[PDB]
Amino acid sequence: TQSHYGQCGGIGYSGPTVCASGTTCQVLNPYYSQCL
Ligand SMILES: *[C@H]1O[C@H](CO)[C@@H](O)[C@H](O)[C@@H]1O
Numbered sequence: 868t869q870s871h872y873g874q875c876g877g878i879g880y881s882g883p884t885v886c887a888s889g890t891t892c893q894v895l896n897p898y899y900s901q902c903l
Contacts, residue, residue, distance in 0.1 A: 868885050869882075870886075870887060871890045871903070872901060872902065875902045877894060877900040878898045880898070880900070887902065890902040891903055
């Protein structure tokens with residue numbers, strides 16, 4: 868699972884888009900999405 872303050876899954880990011888329990892994949896920027 869993607870860690871806190873890391874990029875979870877934005878446009879172009881291929882990988883584990885599911886964040887760790889309690890952290891939410893928030894799309895901050897068009898490509899930058901972060902697990903908060
Ligand atoms: C890998 O997966 C990511 C998932 O967000 C895509 O954005 C990318 O285009 C590729 O399919």
